[PDB]
Swiss-Prot record:
Compartments where found: Host nucleus
Domain notes for this protein: There are 3 rolling circle replication (RCR) motifs. RCR-2 is probably involved in metal coordination. RCR-3 is required for phosphodiester bond cleavage for initiation of RCR.
Binding partners and assembly: Interacts with the capsid protein; this interaction relocates Rep into the nucleus.
Portion of the parent chain present: 163 to 305 of 314
Described purpose of this protein according to its UniProt entry: Essential for the replication of viral ssDNA. The closed circular ssDNA genome is first converted to a superhelical dsDNA. Rep and/or Rep' binds a specific hairpin at the genome origin of replication. Introduces an endonucleolytic nick within the conserved sequence 5'-AGTATTAC-3' in the intergenic region of the genome, thereby initiating the rolling circle replication (RCR). Following cleavage, binds covalently to the 5'-phosphate of DNA as a tyrosyl ester. The cleavage gives rise to a free 3'-OH that serves as a primer for the cellular DNA polymerase.
Name of the protein this chain belongs to: Replication-associated protein
Positions that bind ATP: 13-20
Family: Belongs to the nanoviruses/circoviruses replication-associated protein family.
Amino acid sequence: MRDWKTNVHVIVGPPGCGKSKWAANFADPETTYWKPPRNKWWDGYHGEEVVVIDDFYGWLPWDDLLRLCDRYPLTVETKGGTVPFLARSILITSNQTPLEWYSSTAVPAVEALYRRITSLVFWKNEQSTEEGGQFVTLSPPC
């Protein structure tokens, strides 16, 4: 079903900075599904190539997030049964950097998530692309 690395783009900035608009402008609405915040459900997903996880703060199980952001065939759960996960792009909007989503105490190796992140975009003081290995995200990605 999926046989490709799902790209993972994290967009960080304060409330009202245009995070949701950045996500909406990434690709066509017809190709973009918005994951309901704060639950494990993929209700309404119909195989869209772009998935947006708006206002993420680490409310998916670590291991589920690692799977979503990986490259193997994967089904995800809805209230009416599983559906194939077919994202080619996952956009994660957040007020915090990924440092803050999961503590290193709660997880085997935090670099497992960071290595699966493809790009980091940061609200300055506009949205600028950052180069993993920087002041605001210490860790390497991709």
